[PDB]
Amino acid sequence: MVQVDGGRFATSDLNDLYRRLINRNNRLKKLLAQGAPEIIIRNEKRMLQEAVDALLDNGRRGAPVTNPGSDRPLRSLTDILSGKQGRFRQNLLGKRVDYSGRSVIVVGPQLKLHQCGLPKRMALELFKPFLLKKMEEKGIAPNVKAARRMLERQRDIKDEVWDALEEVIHGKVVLLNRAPTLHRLGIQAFQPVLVEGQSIQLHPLVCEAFNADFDGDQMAVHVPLSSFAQAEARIQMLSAHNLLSPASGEPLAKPSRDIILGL
């Protein structure tokens, strides 16, 4: 039961289901203590069973209990657990993650196969703690708190922090992903090249594995943090190291379109 931005209150439906259950239980206790006839007690017990059913699995038996003035069924525990929106598929087998970004993609013909164009501001946000540490190593900031306070305002950003960010991302790789991720090559590891502008630059040869084109596609970027994750990405997930299809064994990164045309 939480107070939102405007001071209004928002609460879970489980609280209303629990309130139904508790009201009916206390009323049953009072009816028993006051010696009610068996018809009243039977009605109350059947209502108590219905309330327990509503709490555990609403709509399972009988009409689903709704809040007043609404046809929306209250969300029971079973509804929380199962389904595409359920706990398993939404918060256990998959999660929203930190150190991630997203932007429109642009063809980067000048890139090497192991490279991708990464906007400067996206990289500043994605590698922000590394950048704070580097700005503390160099004399750009007295400590990490001052470096963060300095990065907070865009007009306080000087040009030495861009060189520090270049130093930070050295040798490291990022993960590019495009939905739908139909096979494992929907995610690939690339060495980032910092670029002005707000577009991600994608190598042409990998456009077939991503099924990506440039009529408006967007891609997500992820930063593997540990030395272990970085090694996994650079060795196993690097674009230049996956040249053949795991399905057919044929080449996947191969000439196409303009390249074939010119040759």
Binding site: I39, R42, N43, R46, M47, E50, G62
Partner: peptide, 14 residues
Amino acid sequence: SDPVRQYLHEIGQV
């Protein structure tokens, strides 16, 4: 299956 109909039937027996 309808609790109200069941309760009304039980009421109608007295």
